[PDB]
Structures are given as C-alpha cells and as structure tokens.
RNA sequence: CCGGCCGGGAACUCAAAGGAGACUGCCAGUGAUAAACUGGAGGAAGGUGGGGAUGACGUCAAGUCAUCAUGGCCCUUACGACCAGGGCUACACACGUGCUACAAUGGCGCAUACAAAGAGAAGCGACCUCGCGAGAGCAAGCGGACCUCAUAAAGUGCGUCGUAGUCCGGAUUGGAGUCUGCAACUCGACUCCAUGAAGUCGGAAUCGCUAGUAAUCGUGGAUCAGAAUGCCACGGUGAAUAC
RNA sequence: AAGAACCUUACCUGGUCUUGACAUCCACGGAAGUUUUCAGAGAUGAGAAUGUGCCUUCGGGAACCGUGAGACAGGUGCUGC
C-alpha cells in the first residue's frame, strides 16, 4: 500500500484509491489497472505485495507526483519569463482563458479585499 | 440606417458571389484529407489572402431589406422585427395573423 | 381568500393499503414531484416499524400519530397596536396534516444514513414518546397552555 | 446603508459624491435604519433633478426633487425623504 | 397514380380548390381517393413589439399552411390535360408527382 | 399607444388580406419586397388618383395588381394608355406578366384611407383642423356609416406643444371582432412637423 | 489550440521575411498581422507588431515559435 | 363479442378492447407486470374494476401510445370505463359516484411570454 | 424472415374540414311574487368550463431623433467616405437576473420503459468505416404524417460507494485535440488526459406560486459560418395549502 | 442586441479620399465584363491581356465603366422638453 511516494488509502476500492496520486484520475486508473490485470472493485487491503509490485512499474510511465508537479511549473515559468499574454495573467493572478473579470474573477483572486 | 453601410454590404454580396461559390474549391477540394498533402495544399491556405477579404459569405450581416437594420432580423420575411409587424397588421404579408393557443 | 370557499378535490388512495391518510403522508415527503422515489422510502420505513415494535404495520402508524397530533394551535392575532399569541382549537382535518408534517421535518434532520431508516427510527420513538417529533407537540402545547389568558371561548 | 450614485447627463465629481453621502448621513440615524439606496441625478435643460429610492425593513420609498443648481435639489430631496421616514416610523411603532 | 399534393394559406380557399379538382376527376375518368387532409405546418414567429426596451412586451404571429392530397388511382388521358389549364383561385400551389 | 391594430386583429374573421399568393420559405422573401417595391411605386404617382388599397395576387409566374381607387377615370386617363404605362414598369420591378385592373369604390367618404388622405391634404394647405375633422365625420354619417372616429395628433396649428383631438360619432366598437371596421392612417408633412391622422369607420357587424 | 492543418502566416509578412533574412538583419518590421504564427524562419529578428495605437518591438527568440505575433503585444493598458 | 371504448387523458390515447374470458390483461403485447406492474400508481388500472367484480371474468387487449407512465395509465382507467358499454347504467350509475368517467381534461398550460413556466414570474426583488 | 413486414381492412387511434354541445337550460329551497343565490339531477365538461388574444377616457411634458419618418439647428476637402489593427470581452469594487451546487429522496456502472412540439436545399445529413472522444471519410434519403436532426431524460432493475469536503462538487490551470471561418493571440464552441477551488443549506432582508400550478426532468425553435446557463415554445413526473 | 473573433461597429490609433460609398441631371470617352503582375497593413496606385451586341436616327437609343463643373449627396451629429 505504497505507490509513487505516499499512497496510503486503506479499504478504498481499487480504481478509487489510486487517484490519491497527484497525476491520475479515474480514467487513467482504470487504464493503469487494466494493463496489470486486477479487478477494479477490490479493496487494496486484499492486495498482496506480489500484486502491488505490478502497480509500481505500471504507474512509472505516466508521470506522477515527483515530476508532474514541476512539468506544469516548467510551462508557467516559461510563459512568465517570455512575457506573453498568458504569462502576464499568470504574473498578476488573473484568469487566463479569457473569462469574465468585471464581476466574478474570484476563484483566481481568492478572497475579496474591502 | 447609415446609407453608406446599406451600400457597403450590397458591395459584399456581389463580391462574395463572384469569387466564392466559383473558387470554393480552394477550401473544400484541395484543403482537406487527400493524396495531395504536399505544397499544393500549402498554397491553398496562402492564396486566399491575396483574394479580397470582403468575399467570404460570413461577412454578411443580413440586414433588413427596407430600413437596413442589422439587429432583429427574420430570415422568413427578409425584414427587420419592426417592418414585419407594421406590414402584418396592414395585411401585406399573406397568411400572417395573430396566434393563440 | 376574500371570496371563494374553495371546491375541494379528492386524493387517490395508497395501492398497498386501503388508505388515503398514508397517501396524504407520501405526498408530503414527495420532494420535487417524485412519487415512486417517495413511495419506496415509506414502504421500507413501515416494514421496519413492524419488527421494531411487534405490531402490525398500518395501525402502528397512527399510534405514532396520536402521540404527535396536537389539540390546540397558537396564532398571532393583531389587536390594538401589538400582536399576541392567542390559542385556537384545531380542526381535525388539519390536526393529522399538521402532525405528519412535523414527522417529515424531524426526519430530514436527525441525520442518520438512509432516509428509510431515518423515518423508521422516530416513528418508533413517536410511540415511546421520547423522539423530537413529540417534543414539537409538547412545546406547542407548552406555549398554548401558557397563553390560556387569551380567549373568548372556554373549550 | 449602501449608496449607489448615478448621473444621467451629470457626470458626478468627487466633491458632489461626498456632498451626497454627508447629506445622506443625516437622514440616516436621525430617522430610520435603512438597507440600500439608489440615487439618480438628472439635468433636463433647466431642471437639476435628483431622485432617490430607499429600501427599508417594511418596503420601499421614493422621492424626487427638481431644484436650482443640483445642490438645492438634493437639499430638497432629503426633506422630502425625511418626512416620509417619520411617517413610516410611527406607522411601525403604534404604542 | 398522380400524387397531386397542394398547399395554401387559407383553409376556406384550399377546400374550394380541391373540390374543383375531385369533381372534374369524376366527371371524366374515375377512381378518386378523396381529398385526404394532411397535417398543417404552424410556423410561429415571436416578435418584439417596441422599437426599444420592454422585452416582455411581445407579439406572437403564425402562418397556418394547410395541405391537401387527392391521389388518383389510375390515370386517364382526358384528365391529365384537364388538370393543367385549371389553376384558378390564386393562393394555392400544386405540385404533381407520378 | 396601447391598442391593437383594428385591421390586423380581425384578419380571418371579416377583413381579407391585401396579398393572396402562396410561397414556401425559399421564395417567400424576394416575393415580399418586390410586392413592397410595387406598393411604394404605385403610391408615388397615383396619389392624385385617390387610391384606397392595392390587392396583389401572383398566380403561376404572374402578378395581378387590382387598384382600388375613387376616381377611375384619371388613373387610366384618356384611352387607358396609362394603365399599360404602369404595366410596363410593374413588369420592370417584379417578374414579367402583370394584369393591372381597377375596381373603383362608389363612396369615397366611407373608406378609411380616402377619408384620411382628404384631411391630410387639407392640413398641409393650411386649413383649420377643427374644420377638417368635423367636415369629415358629417359627410360619412349622412351617407350610411353607422359610426366613425377621426383622431388627429401633432402640433395642430403651430403650437409648440402637441395635443390630440378626436370627434367620434355613432358606434365605433373596437373590442368586438365580428364588426367590420375599416381603419387606416396617413401623415401630414406640414411646416411645423408631422401631423398624424387615423380614421376608424364602422359599417356592420357581420 | 486550433487550425489542425498548417500554421497560418500572411503573405505580406512571409515574403517580407525572405526579403529580410538573406539580405542581413534589417529594420523593425512594421506589421499589423497579429493573426500570424511565429515560424522558425524569423528567429533573431526585430518585429514591430501593432498593439492598437503603436508598434511594440519584439525580438523573436528561439522559443516563441509555438505562439503568435499578437500574444507578445499587449493591447489594453491597466494601471 | 368484442366491445370498445376509446379513453384518453393528458396527451395519451388508449384503445381498449374487452370480451369475456379469464383474468389476463395485455398492454401492447406485454402484461401489466412487465409494463408498470408495481411502478407509479400501480392499481389505477384495476381500481375501476374493484368497484365491480373482475376476478377471472373479463380479459382485455389494449394498445396505448403517447404520454408518459402515469398519463397512459390514466387513459386506460378512462378507457375500460368507456369499454363497459354493453353493461349499461345498472353498472354505470354507481360508477359516477367514485369518478372514473370524467375526462380529467387538465392539460399542460402553454408557457406565456414574460413568465418562465406559465405562472413563474422572474423574481423582481428588493434585496 | 412475427418487422403493420406483406395482402387486406375504413372499424379504431390520428390527420383537418364540417356540425352537435353548456344555456342557470331542468329540479328543490331562500329572496321584494324581481335580479339573483345555495344545492341536486343529467352530463365529457356547470355557473364568464381551462388558457390565450383583446388594453376604456386618460396618467407619467414615461421610452425611442440609434428601426423609420420628421420640424429646427449644426457639419459638409469633414461631425461625410474607405481600409488595416485594436476596443465594445478592460477590473481594488457595488448591484440586478440566472445556472451549477453543497449530496445517500444521492453519486457512479450496467440493463432498460413511456413523450409532445418543431426545423431542414450554399440545408438536414442515415447506414457503413476510422478515432478513447469531439468528429473524419464514403454517402443514401428528404422541399418533407415518408427521410434526417433523434438515444427523450428523470423513472425502473441490479451492483457499489458508508457520511467523508467524501466515488459530493466541475471552478481554476496545464498538456493534447476537433469543427467553423481568410483568421479563434487579444476574444469562440466542443472533446480528451491531468489538476479537484470555494461550497457542509446560507445574516438582516426578500421573491414566485391556488392545480396539471409550484417544484424538478429532458426536448425543440428563432438569431446564426461558428458561438446560450438567455429568450420563445414543447411534453414527462407531480405536490402541499387557503381558518 | 432573435446571438461584438474580422464583418456587425456607430468608438480608438494610423493609412487615405473628395461632387464623393449611395441618387438624379450636364458634358466628354469607353461595350460591360473576363484573366493576370508589382508595390502596399489594406484601401488604393502602376500595369499586362481579353472583350464588343441589341436600333440606325447612326458624335448613337439603352445597359454598365472612367473625367470635369455645380445643383447637392451624406451625418448611428444635437434636441423625444
């Protein structure tokens, strides 16, 4: 019960507990586990270390917690250093995809100042 | 409604009819999946810019044919939402009457 | 309303038991107009009432209802430049309908896991008179009997 | 109390905005507690006209006053609103 | 075998129009399968009624385009020229099939 | 500014349509502005011919323009050469064909367009408006009309503020739908602005 | 994000590149085509993209070939 | 022989056909229990037939289209009541007393302009 | 080949034309023997059946000179005209209308039952192949009770989640894609993978609704190359309450 | 506003134009139209080829395209008090 650095979800089901890794949702976890041949509705307390070892090398191809946290930072380091439009929205805490900023803009700002 | 702009788009309907719907093969015949993915397909994107810009059918605002109003249009009658009512109540549009259900 | 003593219409009864009283009860917790989802919860909640009380099913329901139905109701009455809580005696067709509304609002809180057992626990506790539905009835009567000083009728 | 000052053909300055809020601080405490204000200033070729819509705990009350130089218009508007606020207050006391 | 399908805007005009056809179809020739009524289209147009604001001020119009079918069984040559040159009461529109 | 158009609400009950052609959604648009462009053209020169209304039918690649007018002699002129003179230039607008007919009206004082243009021609040649509306309603009631209402609005004699005047006579019941009420409107382009006159004329209820 | 077949560049800029790369480094290219992509043929030249009222000079570095010309030309000025 | 009543309710038309036999009922080549046998208002089909006797007396074959699950089922209740035409007002006079023969003509209202769902006004508020 | 599939049938559903019907018409009682009222019978419908259309004289010198028409004034090598690029999408903030929620009357996976209304020719676009998917290729059919959009969804059957910011929530952002169009950087929609924010039922205050209504569920249309949580329509389920 | 990427769009920076983008009238040429090159952000500007009927009064009668003169055209400029 130790996958890709922490991964300690006890008595959760198989495809559900694997999504605790930063780097996998429910689609990849049912794709990762089908590549190793384990039934997807079984709790990981049932799984033995002779079955957990097939999970460790399968999750090593899709990038996870260690480097996935920094590859998405490599892009935002690149855009803020170049000075594009999305870089300055990243540089000022504003929305990037062209959403409304007159009224809401609020999950990007955070709280409200006054 | 700004008589020049009524005269501006009557230029655009003439230009869009003569170049495109005659030279529409530049997009729909060569610029697709083909056994022609060489530089001839690359010229298909490029020579469209030498064409005048006011020749695409997607620059028609489709204004009213009595006042030239760009907003409130109806494709069935070809008039704006004002001139449809004042002709329907007069009795100019055949079949049209007030609806109730 | 000002005019119009309203022409009352009828309710079709319950399929499983020959009662419109429980068919009135299933229409109350029928949220967003979903009757099959409403009727499945109440049938699962009264079969649970039988094993947890020993009796038969439908007459165990009203013995939890006579322990929760009120006899007097207090109102706000506007007189003078203020407004006090005058008590009034309840009509019987409102008396049961005020009772089974108090059951459901106690069943949406008192949070247990499923809705069928949330209703099934206090339908027992209405009969043993320690649930929070009876505490609504006794605190209504606690306010009406404190306000016995307001009334031109003596019954 | 939240002010909402708005002008139709009268672009509000900074001296005029504080002149509204200091005047609307008067008809504040001294008459009633209120929720929300909408102030509208208008110039119609002669009449400096000022409207105001107060929202209170009971309902709404509106007053309008045309004046001389947009300062006497708001000075007549508050006296129109303060009398409607005392009439509404004693309607909700009835001792 | 002619699927003579005809539409109009007025129901009182389209009923006199098909009755002008089915009587000539039995005066010469025979085998008429009636003026069967087909479902009419009811194109509704909701139009704003002011030159400006008040969205909620609107006016609803409609066009009821009535539709009738005759569907003769076996063609005779005396009627196939008689169905042409008889298209009076303007407001109706005929479309023949074979 | 709050009433329904009394001609347009009763269009299947008593009043007929001024256009009686069928077209599906492909040619419905270009039929209608060509119907409009011959309506703006025939009102141009035949304004002195006292035209009431223009009924247009389009049978099978043609057009039939029946002109309702008060003076049928001057619209054809001598010999009838001018009704074929428009017939060359009607065909010039719409598709070829064209058979222009004239169905004259016997009473120019009971048709709502022919009352509304007689006032609006008087208001532009500077007469008193109270003379015009009172002469209009007393001429209609002496000829068989069971009701008339004439309402004029505008500057009304050069006053700097506008007002309305109306001089109804008889029964003009607008809310009943079986009542045949002829209604039309014209405009006076005087030296003070636009003066609008709208005439209701009630004849019968079936 | 879009234009699955072929990147887009305008002819009044594309031919203005191949008359300005073989002839040495030249003037800041006063262009209005913000709609055009950065190709690798213009790496190391000065481009003057129009932002609405002036022409901001941008030096085309090696790593901006995935973007367009208008993304390095801000339009609205805030504070 | 075979008797007919039409029956319809809430944009859903039934076609019921009765004749004497056993107590089977078949709806669009399906029985009741595979169509809505304990679904929403399960007994609304049989409830005009416990006002009378039905135990193994009349078998029937119906075809219903349009509407929904309870809209079809109310059309059958009006339908088989209309089908009891060979059994006249000895059976029908005490059938008016509990309903079952009124059309229940409550249709859905048209959505009006300005409103949202024919009564709902779009919430003009003060706060 | 049990598919209205095929002969056939014209009964039925339905289509849309023409009629019938509901009028306090009938009975009983009260009332000034009047108008009328309350109740009952019959009846599909009973007291203007249900809904729409219909807006009295006027009111606010309300809205519109930017639909249009128009009096007066003003511009007329510019307040006119053309073109590219930008802006109308800016954001410390304030407010109004909506959508999605905070879950177990649910989420998810599989199986599966029943609608109405409407649109379609530079249009709707089957079936068959390819792609995880948005879609792509080939391409019939259809100016349409025929063909296409077009699986209705909630519901129901089974299984799982165990009350946790959770298998709730779908925001934000990164990567990779599709379609439209000359061109989706400013500034489109959608799909895929990943990321999983606030949010645990909401202060003072406030809103809509009297029955097929409220509340929920999906569908369609106009505008339109593309671009609705809006608007206009359509049906499914379906209340509580009115002293 | 029943739907702002360009267009729409009326606003802004910049490139331009003038009896004009749109209408009638006068005078003078050219059938209109079609294909293509260069410069330019495009508008525009310089071109290169092609093209010719309807009535004979025939410098035409029309259609359409250029040049000049004004009468003017144009305005989503102001006042809905």
Swiss-Prot record, chain A:
Its biological purpose: Located at the top of the head of the 30S subunit, it contacts several helices of the 16S rRNA. In the E.coli 70S ribosome in the initiation state was modeled to contact the 23S rRNA (bridge B1a) and protein L5 of the 50S subunit (bridge B1b), connecting the 2 subunits; bridge B1a is broken in the model with bound EF-G, while the protein-protein contacts between S13 and L5 in B1b change. The 23S rRNA contact site in bridge B1a is modeled to differ in different ribosomal states, contacting alternately S13 or S19. In the two 3.5 angstroms resolved ribosome structures the contacts between L5, S13 and S19 bridge B1b are different, confirming the dynamic nature of this interaction.
Name used for this protein in its record: Small ribosomal subunit protein uS13
One of the protein's GO biological processes: cytoplasmic translation
GO MF, one example: rRNA binding
Cross-referenced Gene3D superfamilies: 1.10.8.50, 30s ribosomal protein s13, domain 2 (4.10.910.10)
Keyword rRNA-binding (UniProt): yes
Superkingdom of origin: Bacteria
Keywords: Ribonucleoprotein, Ribosomal protein, RNA-binding, rRNA-binding, tRNA-binding
Subunit note: Part of the 30S ribosomal subunit. Forms a loose heterodimer with protein S19. Cross-links to the P site tRNA and weakly to the A site tRNA. Forms two bridges to the 50S subunit in the 70S ribosome, contacting the 16S rRNA and proteins S19 and L5.
Source species: Escherichia coli (strain K12)
UniProtKB/Swiss-Prot annotation, chain D:
GO biological process terms, semicolon-separated: dormancy process; negative regulation of translation; negative regulation of translational elongation
UniProt xrefs under Pfam families: Ribosomal_S30AE
Keyword Transmembrane helix: no
GO cellular component terms listed in the entry, alphabetical order: cytosol; cytosolic small ribosomal subunit
Keyword Transcription regulation: no
Keywords carried by this UniProt record: Translation regulation
GO molecular function: ribosomal small subunit binding; ribosome binding
Gene deletion effect: Non-essential gene, no formation of inactive 100S ribosomes. Double hpf-yfiA deletion mutants form 90S ribosomes. A quadruple yfiA-hpf-rmf-sra knockout strain is significantly outcompeted by wild-type after 4 days growth. No change in sensitivity to aminoglycoside antiobiotic gentamicin in stationary phase cultures.
InterPro entries per record: HPF/YfiA_ribosome-assoc, RHF-like, RHF/RaiA
Expression induction: Induced during stationary growth phase (at protein level). Induced by the signal autoinducer AI-2.
Function noted in UniProt: During stationary phase, promotes and stabilizes dimerization of 70S ribosomes by the ribosome modulation factor (RMF), leading to the formation of inactive 100S ribosomes. Converts immature 90S particles formed by RMF into 100S ribosomes. Crystallization with T.thermophilus 70S ribosomes shows it binds in the channel between the head and body of the 30S subunit, where mRNA, tRNAs, initiation factors IF1 and IF3 and elongation factor G would bind; however RMF is still able to bind.
Listed name of the protein: Ribosome hibernation promoting factor
Organism encoding this protein: Escherichia coli (strain K12)
From Swiss-Prot, chain F:
Molecular-function annotations in GO: mRNA binding; rRNA binding; structural constituent of ribosome
Record-linked InterPro entries: KH_dom, KH_dom-like_a/b, KH_dom_type_2, KH_sf_prok-type, Ribosomal_S3_C_sf, Ribosomal_uS3_bac-typ, Ribosomal_uS3_C, Ribosomal_uS3_CS
Species assigned in the record: Escherichia coli (strain K12)
Role played: Binds the lower part of the 30S subunit head. Binds mRNA in the 70S ribosome, positioning it for translation.
Domain of life: Bacteria
Protein name: Small ribosomal subunit protein uS3
Keyword Amino-acid biosynthesis (UniProt): no
Any one GO CC term of the record: cytosol
Keyword Ribonucleoprotein annotated: yes
One protein family per Pfam: Ribosomal_S3_C
Domain KH type-2: 38-106
PANTHER family found in the cross-reference section: 30S/40S RIBOSOMAL PROTEIN S3 (PTHR11760), SMALL RIBOSOMAL SUBUNIT PROTEIN US3C (PTHR11760:SF19)
Self-association and partners: Part of the 30S ribosomal subunit. Forms a tight complex with proteins uS10 and uS14. With proteins uS4 and uS5 encircles the mRNA as it enters the ribosome, which may play a role in mRNA helicase processivity. Some nascent polypeptide chains are able to cross-link to this protein in situ. In collided ribosomes contacts ribosome rescue factor SmrB.
GO biological process, one term: ribosomal small subunit assembly
CDD domains assigned to the protein according to its UniProt record, in alphabetical order: KH-II_30S_S3
UniProt-listed PROSITE patterns: KH_TYPE_2, RIBOSOMAL_S3
The entry's keywords: Ribonucleoprotein, Ribosomal protein, RNA-binding, rRNA-binding
Family per record: Belongs to the universal ribosomal protein uS3 family.
UniProtKB/Swiss-Prot annotation, chain G:
One GO BP annotation of this record: ribosomal small subunit assembly
InterPro entries, A to Z: Ribosomal_uS19 (IPR002222), Ribosomal_uS19_bac-type (IPR005732), Ribosomal_uS19_CS (IPR020934), Ribosomal_uS19_SF (IPR023575)
Keywords: Ribonucleoprotein, Ribosomal protein, RNA-binding, rRNA-binding, tRNA-binding
Keyword Flavoprotein found: no
PROSITE patterns: RIBOSOMAL_S19
Gene Ontology terms: cellular component: cytoplasm; cytosol; cytosolic small ribosomal subunit
GO function terms (MF aspect): rRNA binding; structural constituent of ribosome; tRNA binding
PANTHER family in UniProt: RIBOSOMAL PROTEIN S19P FAMILY MEMBER, SMALL RIBOSOMAL SUBUNIT PROTEIN US19M
Self-association state and partner proteins as the record states: Part of the 30S ribosomal subunit. Binds S13 and L5 and cross-links to the A site tRNA.
Known role: In the E.coli 70S ribosome in the initiation state it has been modeled to contact the 23S rRNA of the 50S subunit forming part of bridge B1a; this bridge is broken in the model with bound EF-G. The 23S rRNA contact site in bridge B1a is modeled to differ in different ribosomal states, contacting alternately S13 or S19. In the 3.5 angstroms resolved ribosome structures the contacts between L5, S13 and S19 bridge B1b are different, confirming the dynamic nature of this interaction. Bridge B1a is not visible in the crystallized ribosomes due to 23S rRNA disorder.
Protein family per UniProt: Belongs to the universal ribosomal protein uS19 family.
Protein name: Small ribosomal subunit protein uS19
Species this protein is from: Escherichia coli (strain K12)
Annotated gene: rpsS
């Amino acid at each position: 019960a130790r996958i890709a650095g922490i991964n300690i979800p006890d008595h959760k089901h198989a495809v559900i507990a694997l999504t605790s890794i930063y780097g996998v949702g429910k689609t990849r976890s049912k794709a990762i586990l089908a590549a190793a041949g384990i039934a997807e509705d079984v709790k990981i307390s049932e799984l033995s270390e002779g079955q957990i070892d097939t999970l460790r090398d399968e999750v090593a191809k899709f990038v996870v917690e260690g480097d996935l946290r920094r590859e998405i930072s490599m892009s935002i380091k690149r855009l803020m250093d170049l000075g594009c439009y999305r870089g300055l929205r990243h540089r000022r805490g504003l929305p990037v995809r062209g959403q409304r900023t007159k009224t809401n803009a609020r999950t990007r700002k955070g709280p409200r100042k006054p | 409604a700004k008589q020049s702009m009524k005269a501006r788009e009557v230029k655009r309907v003439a230009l869009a009819d003569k170049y495109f719907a005659k030279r529409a093969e530049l997009k729909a015949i060569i610029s697709d999946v083909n056994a022609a993915s060489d530089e001839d397909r690359w010229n298909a994107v490029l020579k469209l810019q030498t064409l005048p810009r006011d020749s695409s059918p997607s620059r028609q605002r489709n204004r009213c044919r009595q006042t030239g109003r760009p907003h409130g249009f109806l494709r069935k009658f070809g008039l704006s939402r004002i001139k449809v009512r004042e002709a329907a109540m007069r009795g100019e549009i055949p079949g049209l009457k007030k609806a109730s259900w | 309303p000002r005019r119009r003593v309203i022409g009352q219409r009828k309710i079709l009864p319950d399929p499983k038991f020959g009662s419109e009283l429980l068919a009135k009860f299933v229409n109350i917790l029928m949220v967003d107009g979903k009757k099959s989802t409403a009727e499945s919860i109440v049938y699962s909640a009264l079969e649970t009432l039988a094993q947890r009380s020993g009796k038969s099913e439908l007459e165990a329901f009203e013995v939890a209802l006579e322990n929760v139905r009120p006899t007097v109701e207090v109102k706000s009455r506007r007189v003078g430049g203020s407004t006090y809580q005058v008590p009034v005696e309840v009509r019987p067709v409102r008396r049961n309908a005020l009772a089974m509304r108090w059951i459901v609002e106690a069943a949406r809180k008192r949070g247990d896991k499923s809705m069928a057992l949330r209703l099934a626990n206090e339908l027992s506790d209405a009969a043993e008179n320690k649930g929070t539905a009876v505490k609504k009835r006794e605190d209504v009567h606690r306010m009406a009997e404190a306000n016995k000083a307001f009334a031109h009728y003596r019954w | 109390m939240q002010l909402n000052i708005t002008g139709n053909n009268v672009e509000i300055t900074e001296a005029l905005r504080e002149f509204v809020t200091a005047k609307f601080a008067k008809l504040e405490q001294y008459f009633d507690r209120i929720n929300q204000v909408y102030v509208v200033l208008k110039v119609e070729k002669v009449t400096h006209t000022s409207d105001a819509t107060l929202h209170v705990d009971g309902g709404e009350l509106h007053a309008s006053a045309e004046g001389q130089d947009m300062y006497a218009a708001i000075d007549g508007l508050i006296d129109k609103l303060a009398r409607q606020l005392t009439k509404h207050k004693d309607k909700l006391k009835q001792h | 075998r002619i699927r003579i399908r005809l539409k109009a805007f007025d129901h009182r005009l389209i009923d006199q129009a098909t009755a002008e056809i089915v009587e000539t179809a039995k005066r010469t020739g025979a085998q008429v399968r009636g003026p069967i009524p087909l479902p009419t289209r009811k194109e509704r147009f909701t139009v704003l009624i002011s030159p400006h604001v008040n969205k909620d001020a609107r006016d609803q119009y409609e066009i009821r385009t009535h539709l009738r079918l005759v569907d003769i069984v076996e063609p005779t040559e005396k009627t196939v020229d008689a169905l042409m040159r008889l298209d009076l009461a303007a407001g109706v529109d005929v479309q023949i099939s074979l | 500014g709050q009433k329904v158009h009394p001609n347009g609400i009763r269009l299947g009950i008593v009043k007929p349509w001024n256009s009686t052609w069928f077209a599906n959604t492909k040619e419905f648009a270009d039929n209608l502005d060509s119907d409009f462009k011959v309506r703006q053209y025939l009102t141009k020169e035949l304004a002195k011919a006292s035209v009431s209304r223009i009924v247009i039918e389009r049978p099978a690649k043609s057009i039939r323009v029946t002109i309702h007018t008060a003076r049928p002699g001057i619209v054809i002129g001598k010999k009838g050469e001018d009704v074929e003179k428009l017939r060359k230039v009607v065909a010039d607008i719409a598709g070829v064909p064209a058979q222009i007919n004239i169905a004259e009206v016997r009473k120019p004082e009971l048709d709502a367009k022919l009352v509304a243009d007689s006032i609006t021609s008087q208001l532009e040649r500077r007469v008193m408006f109270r003379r015009a509306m009172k002469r209009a309603v007393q001429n209609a009631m002496r000829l068989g009309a069971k009701g008339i209402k004439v309402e004029v609005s505008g500057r009304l004699g050069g006053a700097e503020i506008a007002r309305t005047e109306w001089y109804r006579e008889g029964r003009v019941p607008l809310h009943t739908l079986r009542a045949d009420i002829d209604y039309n409107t014209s405009e006076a382009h005087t030296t003070y602005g636009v003066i609008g006159v709208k005439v209701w004329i009630f004849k019968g209820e079936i | 994000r879009s234009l699955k077949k072929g990147p887009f560049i305008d002819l009044h800029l594309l031919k203005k590149v191949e008359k300005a790369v073989e002839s040495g480094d030249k003037k800041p290219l006063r262009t209005w085509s913000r709609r055009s992509t950065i190709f690798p043929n213009m790496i190391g030249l000065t481009i003057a993209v129009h932002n609405g009222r002036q022409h901001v000079p941008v030096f085309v570095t090696d790593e901006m070939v995935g973007h367009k010309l208008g993304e390095f030309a801000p339009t609205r000025t805030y504070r | 022989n075979q008797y007919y009543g039409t029956g319809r309710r809430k944009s859903s038309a039934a076609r019921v056909f009765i004749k004497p036999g056993n107590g089977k009922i078949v709806i669009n080549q399906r029985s009741l229990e595979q169509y809505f046998g304990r679904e929403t208002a399960r007994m609304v089909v049989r409830q005009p037939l416990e006002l009378v006797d039905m135990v193994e007396k009349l078998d029937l074959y119906i075809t219903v289209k349009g509407g929904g699950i309870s809209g079809q089922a109310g059309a059958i209740r009006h339908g088989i009541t209309r089908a009891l035409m060979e059994y006249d007002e000895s059976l029908r006079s005490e059938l008016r007393k509990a309903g079952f023969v009124t059309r229940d003509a409550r249709q859905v209202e048209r959505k009006k302009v300005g409103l949202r769902k024919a009564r709902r006004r779009p919430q003009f508020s003060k706060r």
